[PDB]
Paper text:
The influenza nucleoprotein (NP) binds to the viral genomic RNA and is essential for its replication. The NP forms homo-oligomers along the vRNA by inserting a loop, located close to its C-terminal tail, into the body domain of a neighbouring NP. NP is a multifunctional protein that influences the structure of the vRNA, with essential roles in nuclear trafficking of vRNAs and replication. However, mutational analysis and structural information suggest that RNA binding is mediated by a basic groove located between the head and body domains.
Residue numbers in the entry: 21 to 389, 418 to 451, 462 to 497
Write the structure that this text describes.
Amino acid sequence: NATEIRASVGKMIDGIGRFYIQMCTELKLSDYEGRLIQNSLTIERMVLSAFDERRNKYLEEHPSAGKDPKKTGGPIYKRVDGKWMRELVLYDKGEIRRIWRQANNGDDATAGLTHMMIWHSNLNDTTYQRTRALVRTGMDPRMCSLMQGSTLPRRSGAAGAAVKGVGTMVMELIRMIKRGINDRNFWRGENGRKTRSAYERMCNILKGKFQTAAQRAMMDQVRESRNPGNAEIEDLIFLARSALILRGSVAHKSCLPACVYGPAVASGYDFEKEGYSLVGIDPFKLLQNSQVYSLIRPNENPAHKSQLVWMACNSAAFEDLRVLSFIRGTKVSPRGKLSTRGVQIASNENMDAMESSTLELRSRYWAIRLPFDKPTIMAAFTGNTEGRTSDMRAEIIRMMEGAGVFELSDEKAANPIVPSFDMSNEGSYFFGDNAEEYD
């Protein structure tokens, strides 16, 4: 049905909220501290860590010597008379798993864990830069607009495949080949047909994201190359360049932090009875009636820190800023022009110099489901005229050289608003990027 899918998604949100409510009490957090997204991020990672048990499926964590492997934790931020202090907590993974299951009526409710994994992915995509991770692979750093989901853990299942961008899959495939060429046994033994089945699916996953017959036909030859080498790497890079113009279709799910679902459940909002959808107005309505706080570093502009959180909640980092600027009712600027840094607080930072602020995650309209940068057409058309030409590579080039919104009062899309884009401002979030690189 279309209403029972809204009910199963609803009970998932309920579980996340009821979980967050419970942990806010066990850690004896204020209501303000409970709505602090920094505490939400820590509470989120811990439960993911409790079920991950060092598989790097729900998250990735760096090892530390002497740390009991059977316990999880993170920094919890608490305030007294306006001064924040970091406190590191340690909980047994087993107990975290029990609280999560108890909050989900006894079920493992793994879909709720992945839900928070996506949110972490969206936030990282919006906060950090992967230009070094691209350059250290042979890819063009100007493919940043293709890297949705590139921070998802190494062993994320098909869960993350849906939101992984063309650029993310291309690199993943390239990496597999680069150690298939520097280790004989990679495709040998059943340890090899282990990785061949994965190579085939990852190829067909990326094939499915392409929406031109020529792009898919060339992925077929990459898939059915019995031993891929530096030849297939070259054409995967070519496909990535074609994806800057003949963009592929990628999922964009609006996953909000637990500090939003948490208080909403305490309000008495039973998401199972009334329903929920990651697509449409419900995620906008949660944020509009939300109240989330965030720590602020000296000289960080609270308005910009709000934008990057709002953009991560809506998974819009890879959309045109002129379009989102009209929806938000305010200019949503490129990352390079944001006078702020990440939401997470490093271990080295001075906590006495930290302030709080209400995040502005509100929008003026909502949406469902413009020329290209010069940086992107330059990257797309730096093809290897140098060397190999082909069949469908020449056709794809030919195709490349050829190249709703509603008011929140409009609850089910009656009067669509024709948009007004101001062509003055840049369209890509990554134009003149200034942000930290991931890890």
